[PDB]
Amino acid sequence: SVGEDFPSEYEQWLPVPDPESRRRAGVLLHPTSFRGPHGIGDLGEEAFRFIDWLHSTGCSVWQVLPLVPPDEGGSPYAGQDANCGNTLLISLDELVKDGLLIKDELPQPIDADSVNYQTANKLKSPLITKAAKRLIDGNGELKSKLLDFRNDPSISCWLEDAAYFAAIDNTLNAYSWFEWPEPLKNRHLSALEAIYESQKEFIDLFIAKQFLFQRQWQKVREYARRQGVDIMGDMPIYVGYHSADVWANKKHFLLNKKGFPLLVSGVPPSETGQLWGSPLYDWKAMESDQYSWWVNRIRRAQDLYDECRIDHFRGFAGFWAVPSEAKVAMVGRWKVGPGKSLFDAISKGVGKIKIIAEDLGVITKDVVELRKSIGAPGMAVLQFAFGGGADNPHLPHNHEVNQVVYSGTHDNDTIRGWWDTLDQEEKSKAMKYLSIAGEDDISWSVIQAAFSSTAQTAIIPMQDILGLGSSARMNTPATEVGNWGWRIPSSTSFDNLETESDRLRDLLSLYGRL
Amino acid sequence: SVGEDFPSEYEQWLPVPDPESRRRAGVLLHPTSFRGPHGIGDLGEEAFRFIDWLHSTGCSVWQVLPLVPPDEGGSPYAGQDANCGNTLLISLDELVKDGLLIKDELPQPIDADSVNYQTANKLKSPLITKAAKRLIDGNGELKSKLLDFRNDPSISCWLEDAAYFAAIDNTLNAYSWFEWPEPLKNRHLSALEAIYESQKEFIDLFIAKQFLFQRQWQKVREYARRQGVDIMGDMPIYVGYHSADVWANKKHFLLNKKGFPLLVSGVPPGQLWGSPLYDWKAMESDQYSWWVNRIRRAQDLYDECRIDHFRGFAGFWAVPSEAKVAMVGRWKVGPGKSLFDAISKGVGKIKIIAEDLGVITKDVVELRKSIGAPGMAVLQFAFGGGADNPHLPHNHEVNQVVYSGTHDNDTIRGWWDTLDQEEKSKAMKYLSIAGEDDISWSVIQAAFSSTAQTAIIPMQDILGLGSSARMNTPATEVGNWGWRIPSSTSFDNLETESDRLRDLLSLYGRL
Ligand SMILES: *[C@@H]1O[C@H](CO)[C@@H](O[C@H]2O[C@H](CO)[C@@H](O)[C@H](O)[C@H]2O)[C@H](O)[C@H]1O
Ligand SMILES: *[C@@H]1O[C@H](CO)[C@@H](O[C@H]2O[C@H](CO)[C@@H](O)[C@H](O)[C@H]2O)[C@H](O)[C@H]1O
Ligand SMILES: OC[C@H]1O[C@H](O)[C@H](O)[C@@H](O)[C@@H]1O
């Protein structure tokens, strides 16, 4: 009490750093990019090697792109399913360890500078199928774990729908499920039973393949955790029309009486607007079952990742809605999103979540208030920092603590590529703010600025750690070809990036991110 | 409703920057440091010129040290009064504009490269006194404003005590008020009346001089505001024993029956400051009226105010007055948030900066945060220890004031010059350094690049000066508080410096 003596240990009663405030860094690297002989990266030895290398740098976060089955262009953002894993990421060597293939059955290696998905599928799928077949034919330990996975209720609430959808899509020659015969289109119960009987094998194999992905991914994730590395995933806010997600939950979407979307996704203008064309959620319909679809989706995201970015997070506050009739985006209108009640339901259903809000571009007051109300960090991207003036939110002096800072994302050129095409006056602006040595090392200048930020989390693409040019760019938006193909050059092994490792560690040490 | 349409003006509903979050910068410069002929800086032409220069740089804050009457060493932190102004800051030329002196009466100029207080007093006091005398003898506008000032209740609750204390101190040859005869020591009413009769002139002149300080300071402060400059003051948490503050409010302090302090201020590993301490629970009983009045006077003088040794509001070190070493003392519980409750109840919205340096405890941080006061970061302290040092830019917070150094630190050049090697190569990795001659701009730039909302630079570092321009060296008793801007350097002569600051403020969004 006021005036009185303190206990004798007053002088030692110091503030202690909050553990949840710990500064950290990480690397954005999608597993398709790993080296190896089978035309695409996978969840085998290169993933563990990369984890060991990441750990040796002092980084404690690994960010991946969505791990869903991609479209035929390779895009993880136009996946065929929101919850399934990309089975082309399955390691054939790991399957040999599991006793599902023998070494002699492995294909002759191929050189694939870049991922060609068609090539990877022709090479790998037959062998994955054969492994999945032996798994299902066996009795024993591994079979028993398939059955647990399959009968686990939090797997089956998406897996069975996904397997039936895939069986029907395989059986039928049709553009999309809109064109399916009515009993399959609208999931008549006896039609579904008839499908199970006639496509039983396909369904069992599909499920077995999802088990193999899950098993190999969970080993990667447990290895990461043992080495102090959290994994940060990614999810687009919208899912595609031709998927089990929509087909098996039509009432949760804005579809007409025939199952065609009334309204589709997009954004307004500069431009004539931008038309994405995804189906939209019936948010008030979802409100009525306590948002169960989204709750299940987050439960699957938790199963895969420690943390998850949500692309186009602004859509939870307000979304642009275009008449599906239209061929241009400008015709739509803004609609009211579910707001915080969604995240209330999720937290009630799943518990504590770690979400990152992708909140780039022009966003409204309600977006910022929603993001803050659930305590989600937003993003800063240094590549965007040098247009306009000193109020640009991407400049380090405007960064916030609860924020994730990138040098660039998978949608941007590499730092070297970006530097190379940078117009004068954005460039001399950058030169004043950044500490630049030689231009060849421009990517380290930007890395350093990200690390020096007050943002709690700094994330760098592997391409920039390797100092690579525009040919290593992962994606160029609004192009339909040449994306998602980058792989680490077959010469660069994780055993040979110790200079890079040391340099990162020096920076992380200097800026308190170890 | 979820799903329904937004109004049509949704696309234009953008976040707006909060005006109270505006990034800004400023300069620490105490007015005694201004150039001029009368042996000390003052509230005349140089103050206005400096404000014009500050404005031309884009800075929007001017920080000063306490404006109280200093001790004979010049220290504004061991003042003779907590609320009075330093009358040696009064400008003689401004008095001529007021018609209280004529130009002919102004003294011959003297060279005073540094402030000598004794020299300034001999030169200026006779003329200030003469001005004060004409003011009280006159019958017009200015006289009428003296009377309003004098009878204004928020002036008289400290001014009358201050004037009587000064009159008694003048009349008596005594070390301190402890040695005064009982009726004056304990303020017997008839003794106070006898003082008024016998020292009437002294008291009226004292009051008039405080009016002249107030008037000149308010003019400086209005001029600052007209040019977009807020003024940030400073106040020490403790006041000195030999002052009206203690004498007229004995019950609010920890004094024995005879009026001698039971306990005095300090800090452990120790350092003995020797100020009387507050009787916080006694203060609790009149809703902290003494502190409330103090903040009211701080509001009158400044837009914002730093409080030195802010940790003392949560816990303070208390040494037996008996002692003359600090290590024999104990930590006591401070008033905490209930003090600031009372202040805000009494005065309204305040803008306080917590001086929260050195080793501070959990309760200090929780109190500071509970009232939303910004704390400090000082780049000169950033390079000892490791990357968790709170003074490193990457650990700065928004609600914070960052300095290159304070008046207690060497200049950046002086600091660089004595810096040991571990710390120096550490600094070289964090800072962007060109030549050693410009080390102060490297640090200025780092302050400006911080996320801290307010960056404050001493004028000595803008001028790139060495250790001889250091304002104060703690725990020394001589050679402090004397620095003046070199008589060669005029504000008309610092456009390069102005431009260079403006470039940096523009780059880091502080304009
Ligand atoms: C955020 O979401 C967008 C989609 O709205 C992604 O865009 C990429 O993927 C789509 C589908 O393959 C493609 O149409 C775009 O050209 C491409 O930019 C972003 O990658 C996400 O960050
Ligand atoms: C913070 O407080 C102390 C004392 O209130 C000031 O210290 C200066 O003044 C005292 C008293 O004149 C002297 O003993 C010290 O050596 C000197 O540093 C600081 O300047 C304030 O910032
Ligand atoms: O320079 C004197 C300083 O000493 C200590 O660091 C005190 O905590 C601080 O209140 C004071 O300003």
Q: Is B9 on the interface with A (CB under 8 A)?
A: no
Quickly count: other Cβ atoms within 10 Å of residue A17's Cβ.
9
Closest Cα partner for A483 from A472, A498, A496?
A472
Closest Cα partner for B447 from B502, B367, B508, B386?
B508
- Tell the burial category of A291 from Cβ atoms under 10 Å away from its Cβ (0-12, 13-18, 19+): buried
Which amino acid is present at B305?
A: C
* Structure tokens that stand for A183 in this block: 């009993």
Q: Does B473 contact ligand 2 (Cβ within 6 A)? A: no
What is the CA(B235)–ligand 3 centre distance, in A?
13
Element holding B197 (H helix, E strand)? helix B189-198
CB B335 to CB A453 under 8 A? no
Q: Is A9 on the interface with B (CB under 8 A)?
A: no
Domain, as residue range, for B37: 19-511
Nearest to A335 among B6, B11, B396 (CB): B6
- Give the three-class secondary structure for A336: strand
Determination technique for this PDB entry?
A: X-ray
User: A457, A61 in Cβ contact below 8 A?
Assistant: yes
Dihedral Cα A209, A215, A216, A221, nearest 10 deg: 140
Q: Rounded CA gap, A504 and A489, in Å?
A: 20
**Geometric angle at alpha carbon A15, from A14 and A16, rounded to 5°:** 110
Q: Rounded CA gap, A245 and A237, in Å?
A: 13
What is the CA(B166)–ligand 3 centre distance, in A?
30
* Structure tokens that stand for B302 in this block: 């400044």
Q: Which of residues 121-160 of B touch A (CB under 8 A)?
A: none
Active site residue B495: no
Q: What is the DSSP string of B122-178?
A: HHHHHHHHHHHHHHHH--SHHHHHHHHHHH-HHHHHHHHHHHHHHHHHHH---SSGG
CATH classification at residue B348: 3.20.20.80
- Does residue A92 lie within any of the structural domains? yes
Q: Does A411 contact ligand 1 (Cβ within 6 A)? A: yes
Closest Cα partner for A459 from A470, A469, A450, A446?
A450
Q: Is A5 on the interface with B (CB under 8 A)?
A: yes
Q: What is the DSSP string of B396-457?
A: --SSEEEES--TTS--HHHHHHT--HHHHHHHHHHS----GGGHHHHHHHHHHHSS-SEEEE
Pocket probe mutation, ligand 3, options B357, B364, B401, max atoms within 8 Å of Cβ: B357
- Does residue A5 lie within any of the structural domains? no
- Does residue A81 lie within any of the structural domains? yes
Provide the pairing of β-strand A274-279 with B375-378: unpaired
For residue A252, give how far its alpha carbon lies from the nearest alpha carbon of chain B (Å): 12
**Residue A511 to residues A22, A449, B307, B401, B444, Cα–Cα distance (Å):** 12, 10, 31, 20, 20
Closest Cα partner for B459 from B447, B475, B480, B444?
B444
Ligand 1 atom nearest A278 alpha carbon: 5
Quickly count: other Cβ atoms within 10 Å of residue A254's Cβ.
19
Question: Helices H, strands E: what count in chain A?
Answer: 18, 12
Ligand 1 atom nearest A480 alpha carbon: 16
Q: B402 to chain A: which residues are within 8 Å by CB?
A: none
- Does residue A11 lie within any of the structural domains? no
What number of C-beta contacts closer than 8 Å exist between A and B?
Answer: 128
Resolution of the solved structure (Å): 2.3
* Structure tokens that stand for B164 in this block: 């009587």
- Does residue A13 lie within any of the structural domains? no
User: B377, B391 in Cβ contact below 8 A?
Assistant: yes
Ligand nearest to the CA of A320: 1
Q: What is the DSSP letter of A6?
A: P
- Does residue A2 lie within any of the structural domains? no
**Geometric angle at alpha carbon B289, from B285 and B291, rounded to 5°:** 115
- Does residue B9 lie within any of the structural domains? no
Provide the pairing of β-strand B352-354 with B375-378: unpaired
Maximum Cα interatomic distance, chain A, rounded to a whole number of Å: 86
Give me the active site residues of A, please: 311, 358, 411
Question: How many structural domains are present in chain A?
Answer: 1
User: B404, B380 in Cβ contact below 8 A?
Assistant: yes
What is the CA(B77)–ligand 2 centre distance, in A?
6
Q: Rounded CA gap, B90 and B211, in Å?
A: 11
- Does residue B7 lie within any of the structural domains? no
Q: A317 to chain B: which residues are within 8 Å by CB?
A: none
Q: Rounded CA gap, B301 and B225, in Å?
A: 13
The residue contributing the CA closest to ligand 2 atom 18 is B474
User: A62, A224 in Cβ contact below 8 A?
Assistant: yes
Q: A453 to chain B: which residues are within 8 Å by CB?
A: 394
Radius of gyration of chain A (CA): 24
Q: B6 to chain A: which residues are within 8 Å by CB?
A: 318, 333-336
Which amino acid is present at B246?
A: V
Q: Does B357 contact ligand 3 (Cβ within 6 A)? A: yes
CB crowding B93-120: b at 16 or more within 10 Å, else e: bbbbebebbeeeeeeeeeebebbbbeeb
Q: Is B330 on the interface with A (CB under 8 A)?
A: yes
Ligand nearest to the CA of B82: 2
